[PDB]
Amino acid sequence: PLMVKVLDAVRGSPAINVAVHVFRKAADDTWEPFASGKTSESGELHGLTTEEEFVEGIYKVEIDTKSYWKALGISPFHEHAEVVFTANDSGPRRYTIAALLSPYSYSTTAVVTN
Amino acid sequence: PLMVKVLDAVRGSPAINVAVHVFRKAADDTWEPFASGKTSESGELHGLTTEEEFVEGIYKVEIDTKSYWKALGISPFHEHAEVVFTANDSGPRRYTIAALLSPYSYSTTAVVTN
Amino acid sequence: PLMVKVLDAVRGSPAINVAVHVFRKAADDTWEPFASGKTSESGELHGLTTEEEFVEGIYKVEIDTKSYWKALGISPFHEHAEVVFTANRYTIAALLSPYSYSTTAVVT
Amino acid sequence: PLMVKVLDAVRGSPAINVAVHVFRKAADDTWEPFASGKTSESGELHGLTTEEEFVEGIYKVEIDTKSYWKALGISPFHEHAEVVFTANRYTIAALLSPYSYSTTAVVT
Ligand SMILES: Nc1[nH]nc2nccc(-c3ccccc3)c12
Ligand SMILES: Nc1[nH]nc2nccc(-c3ccccc3)c12
Ligand SMILES: [Ca+2]
Ligand SMILES: [Ca+2]
Ligand SMILES: [Ca+2]
Numbered sequence: 001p002l003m004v005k006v007l008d009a010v011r012g013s014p015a016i017n018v019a020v021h022v023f024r025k026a027a028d029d030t031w032e033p034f035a036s037g038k039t040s041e042s043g044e045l046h047g048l049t050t051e052e053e054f055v056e057g058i059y060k061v062e063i064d065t066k067s068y069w070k071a072l073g074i075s076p077f078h079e080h081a082e083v084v085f086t087a088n089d090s091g092p093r094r095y096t097i098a099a100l101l102s103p104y105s106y107s108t109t110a111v112v113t114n
Numbered sequence: 115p116l117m118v119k120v121l122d123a124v125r126g127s128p129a130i131n132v133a134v135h136v137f138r139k140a141a142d143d144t145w146e147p148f149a150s151g152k153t154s155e156s157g158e159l160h161g162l163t164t165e166e167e168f169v170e171g172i173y174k175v176e177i178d179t180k181s182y183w184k185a186l187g188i189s190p191f192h193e194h195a196e197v198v199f200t201a202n203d204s205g206p207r208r209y210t211i212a213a214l215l216s217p218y219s220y221s222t223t224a225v226v227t228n
Numbered sequence: 229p230l231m232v233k234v235l236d237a238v239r240g241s242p243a244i245n246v247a248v249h250v251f252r253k254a255a256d257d258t259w260e261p262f263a264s265g266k267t268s269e270s271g272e273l274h275g276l277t278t279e280e281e282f283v284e285g286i287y288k289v290e291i292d293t294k295s296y297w298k299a300l301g302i303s304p305f306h307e308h309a310e311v312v313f314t315a316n317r318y319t320i321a322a323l324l325s326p327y328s329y330s331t332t333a334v335v336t
Numbered sequence: 337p338l339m340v341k342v343l344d345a346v347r348g349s350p351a352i353n354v355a356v357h358v359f360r361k362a363a364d365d366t367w368e369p370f371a372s373g374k375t376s377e378s379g380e381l382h383g384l385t386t387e388e389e390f391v392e393g394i395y396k397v398e399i400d401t402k403s404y405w406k407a408l409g410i411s412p413f414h415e416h417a418e419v420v421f422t423a424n425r426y427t428i429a430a431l432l433s434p435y436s437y438s439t440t441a442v443v444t
């Protein structure tokens with residue numbers, strides 16, 4: 001139910017080995033850790049969660065763009081890229097968060113399917 | 115060797131049934147038709163060409179964004195989105211042209227693999 | 229030293245009357261208020277800070293994109309758009325759609 | 337009536353000294369030269385045309401992104417970036433990376 005895909009606009013490639021941390025807002029309004037992983041050789045991250053565990057909530061997907069660029073020996077601008085959204089409010093959906101990265105820029109979109 | 119993927123930034127969905135026309139620059143510097151198709155329910159267009167037919171050249175991928183929006187009953191800004199590139203100059207590659215559409219904006223990236 | 233500019237990819241316009249709050253990260257890893265305002269008719273927010281106030285540090289720009297889309301009658305995906313960067317003249321530009329946003333930095 | 341603005345997503349800067357040629361589509365479906373210039377230090381190209389010259393029609397903005405990247409020593413993917421639209425004040429903005437570009441229209 002939750003997938004992340006990341007592309008690199010400088011190299012013309014998937015963005016491989018990008019760390020992604022997902023948080024869920026708790027009852028007390030703090031962010032609680034929900035899941036994490038890293039993108040594969042295709043720039044995709046599957047397996048973050050399950051239909052059972054991906055309940056309604058406000059979720060934050062934090063893509064570690066900084067470490068990605070630094071590993072390439074590049075000094076990037078942003079600390080991270082985050083996507084924060086309310087999930088499953090009108091019933092279960094599947095969410096793909098797609099991101100396109102450059103050292104001084106990022107773009108994200110969501111693909112939501114029923 | 116050539117795939118096109120299109121997403122819709124307004125609906126949060128694949129951009130389905132988008133016409134895509136591919137041209138190749140001929141010897142006389144004119145654009146010649148090379149291949150065409152339309153995106154599927156996943157927003158993807160496979161099958162445009164083959165390894166045999168996708169020789170070196172300068173290619174134009176013209177994504178019919180205008181008809182896409184008009185079909186949704188929306189009046190868009192651009193006539194189309196085009197990506198023009200030299201292909202296969204240092205040997206065969208696989209190319210994915212990924213696009214993200216809004217009525218007054220588009221973004222494209224290339225994923226090139228060996 | 230810091231300018232925010234917001235554009236609307238649906239309407240092909242500046243994103244006007246967008247609330248923007250800027251925070252600086254404190255030593256305890258909490259976020260100190262720093263600047264705020266609403267984008268103008270040109271989608272720009274100028275006058276956030278001065279050179280003497282704007283010291284090196286990690287800054288967060290929180291753009292209230294949800295209220296923007298709802299005031300236009302459009303259901304938005306995101307709760308907000310928050311842009312976090314280290315300062316080491318900065319323009320933070322954002323291009324908004326209901327299910328997507330893009331941001332770039334122009335540092336001159 | 338027509339302005340072009342170009343930004344560089346790699347360097348976090350305006351894209352300076354970018355050649356831009358504007359064409360208007362003729363009745364025979366060929367392309368008549370209309371305006372051209374190079375982006376300034378702010379990445380902007382102003383003064384392309386006047387109100388009386390800028391009539392309704394289909395316009396093509398051809399941005400020489402390949403020469404831009406090569407002058408910086410960077411191998412680019414695209415031959416150029418060409419933006420085609422009907423005019424029915426227009427800013428055509430483009431954000432460049434070596435393998436990607438994004439463009440939006442701001443019509444006010
Ligand atoms: N997330 C993104 N922000 N900007 C983009 N520009 C082009 C493509 C993607 C994208 C990724 C995967 C498939 C299709 C599109 C973009
Ligand atoms: N043309 C564009 N494509 N993608 C973009 N992403 C962020 C910002 C801009 C942009 C440019 C000028 C002002 C405000 C926004 C972008
Ligand atoms: Ca509910
Ligand atoms: Ca060759
Ligand atoms: Ca320092």
Ligand SMILES: [Ca+2]
Pocket residue numbers: 392424
């Ligand atoms: Ca008319």
